[PDB]
Design a protein around this ligand. Structure first.
Ligand SMILES: C[C@H](Oc1ccc(-c2ccccc2)cc1)C(=O)O
Length: 435
C-alpha cells in the first residue's frame, strides 16, 4: 500500500474501523520505512479523535485541537484538510510528503477537493503514495452500504417546517435522534418546533461545529439537528437518523453571481454517510433510518468543484504545471486547467480575502482578479439594485470605514455571505473594514 506511484482507496463500510484499527497500523509501517507522512483530518473534532487512536505514536499535531507539545523527532504530521490546502497556497514550504493519508476523503468542501487533486497529481507523476479513507468514494451509487448491525430503513415523508399534526412518529420515539436538514435556517425552524414540544435540541453547522459538538457528550439531549457537516466522521450515541435527503447547491449563474439552489436531492455518498451515523454498534441491532426523498447526482455543476480549480490553479506544483482534479470527480466541473491562474500580487490578495476575509473562494477570486487590494471595500456598495442584500425584509446597512451609512449592495453577489444571520453579520463586519 505504501509503495510509491500508488493511490489506494480504503473503502471498508462505515464503522469498520478505518480510523481506530487500520490507521495506526499504516502509521507504524510508515515510520518503520522512514516515509515522511501527512495525515489529513476533515475537522478539529476528528483531529482530536485521531490523537486518541494514535496515542503513543510519534505524530506532530499541526492543530490547536490537541494539547501535546511534541518532541521534534516526528516524521508524521497531522493537520486538517483546509490547513494543508492553505499552507500550499501561502509562501510557506510544505514538505513533499512520501505518503499522503486523507481520512473522510469524501468531503466535498473546496479545500478538500483541491487537496485530493494535488495529492493524486503527485501520485500520477510517480512522486508519492496516497491512501484515501472513505466508505463512499466519488461516484458511489449505493446509498445503503453494510453496517456493524442491521438497520431498519423506512421511506417516509419528513417535515421540513414546523408542524402541528401528521408526524407523531417523530416525537413518540424515546431514544436519541440525529436529523439532517438542508440548511441552518431550516434547522432553526425544526429545532424551535421540537423545543416547544418539550424536546432538548442541539444544533450543528460548519461555523458552530466544535463548540456545539462538545454539548453532545457533556449534556443530555433528545435531538441533534445538523447540516451535512456531520457526514464527516462525527459520531453520536443515537438509535435513529431522520434524513430529509436534501441539501443546498451553490450554482454560479452566467459566471457573475452565486445562488444557493434548492433544497434538492443529496448524492448517494451523502445519503450513505447520513445513514452511516447509526447501525455502528454490533450489540444494538435495530437502529432506524427514516428517509424523506431520493438521491441524485447533484455534485455535477456544483460551485465547489469550480472553486477547487480556482485554488489548484494558484498552487505551485512544478514550473508552469498545474494539478488536475482527482480523476473520478474531474467531470463535475467544465473548466480549463490554468484559467484561474493569478499574477503574484493578485494571488496574494486572493489568499488574504479567504484566510483573513473569510470570503467564499468564488467571491475572493472575483475581487482579486479585478485588481482590487485586500483593504479596499468600495466594491461592497457599488453593485446593481438587484444585488441589494436584505436583512429581515429591509436592505442591510452598515457604516463604512469612512463613517458613512450605506446599503450593502456588493458588485458580485454570492448568496453564501448572507445564507443565515451569522454569515450576514460577518459580511457586514467585512464591508465595514473591521477585518
Ligand atoms: C491555530 C492552529 O494552527 C496551527 C498550524 C500549524 C501548527 C504547527 C505545529 C508544529 C509545526 C508546524 C506547525 C500548529 C498550529 C490550528 O489551525 O488549529
Amino acid at each position: 500500500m505504501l509503495k510509491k506511484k500508488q493511490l489506494t482507496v480504503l473503502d471498508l463500510h462505515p464503522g469498520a474501523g478505518k480510523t481506530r484499527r487500520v490507521l495506526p497500523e499504516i502509521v507504524r509501517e510508515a515510520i518503520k520505512k522512514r516515509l515522511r507522512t501527512v495525515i489529513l483530518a476533515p475537522t478539529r473534532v476528528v483531529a482530536a479523535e485521531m490523537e486518541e487512536a494514535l496515542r503513543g505514536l510519534p505524530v506532530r499535531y499541526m492543530t490547536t485541537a490537541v494539547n501535546v507539545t511534541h518532541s521534534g523527532t516526528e516524521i508524521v504530521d497531522l493537520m486538517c484538510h483546509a490547513t494543508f490546502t492553505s499552507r500550499l497556497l501561502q509562501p510557506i514550504r510544505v514538505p513533499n510528503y512520501n505518503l499522503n493519508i486523507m481520512d473522510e476523503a469524501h468531503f466535498t468542501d473546496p479545500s478538500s477537493i483541491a487537496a485530493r487533486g494535488y495529492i493524486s497529481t503527485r501520485v500520477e507523476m510517480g512522486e508519492a503514495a496516497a491512501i484515501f479513507m472513505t466508505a463512499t468514494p466519488p461516484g458511489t451509487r449505493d446509498a445503503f452500504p453494510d453496517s456493524n448491525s442491521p438497520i431498519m430503513d423506512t421511506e417516509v415523508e419528513v417535515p421540513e417546517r414546523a408542524w402541528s399534526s401528521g408526524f407523531d412518529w417523530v416525537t413518540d420515539h424515546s431514544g436519541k435522534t440525529v436529523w439532517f436538514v438542508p440548511s441552518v435556517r431550516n434547522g432553526n425552524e425544526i429545532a424551535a418546533c421540537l423545543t416547544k414540544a418539550g424536546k432538548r435540541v442541539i444544533q450543528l453547522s460548519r461555523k458552530t461545529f466544535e463548540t456545539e459538538f462538545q454539548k453532545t457528550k457533556n449534556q443530555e439531549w433528545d435531538f441533534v439537528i445538523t447540516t451535512d457537516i456531520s457526514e464527516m466522521g462525527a459520531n453520536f450515541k443515537a438509535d435513529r437518523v431522520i434524513d430529509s435527503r436534501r441539501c443546498l447547491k451553490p450554482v454560479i449563474l452566467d459566471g457573475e453571481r452565486v445562488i444557493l439552489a434548492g433544497p434538492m436531492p443529496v448524492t448517494h455518498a451523502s445519503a450513505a454517510q447520513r445513514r452511516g451515523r447509526i447501525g455502528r454498534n454490533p450489540n444494538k441491532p435495530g437502529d432506524e433510518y427514516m428517509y424523506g426523498g431520493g438521491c441524485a447526482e447533484t455534485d455535477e455543476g456544483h460551485a465547489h468543484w469550480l472553486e477547487a480549480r480556482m485554488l489548484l490553479d494558484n498552487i505551485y506544483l512544478q514550473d508552469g504545471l498545474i494539478a488536475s482534479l482527482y480523476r473520478p470527480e474531474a467531470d463535475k466541473v467544465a473548466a480549463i486547467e490554468g484559467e484561474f491562474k493569478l499574477r503574484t500580487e493578485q494571488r496574494k490578495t486572493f489568499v488574504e480575502l479567504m484566510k483573513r476575509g473569510d470570503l467564499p473562494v468564488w467571491l475572493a477570486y472575483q475581487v482579486a482578479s479585478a485588481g482590487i487590494t485586500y483593504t479596499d471595500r468600495r466594491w461592497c456598495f457599488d453593485g446593481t439594485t438587484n444585488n441589494t442584500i436584505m436583512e429581515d425584509s429591509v436592505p442591510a446597512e452598515v457604516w463604512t470605514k469612512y463613517g458613512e451609512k450605506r446599503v450593502l449592495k456588493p458588485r458580485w453577489m454570492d448568496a453564501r455571505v448572507c445564507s443565515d444571520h451569522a454569515a450576514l453579520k460577518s459580511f457586514k463586519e467585512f464591508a465595514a473594514g473591521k477585518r
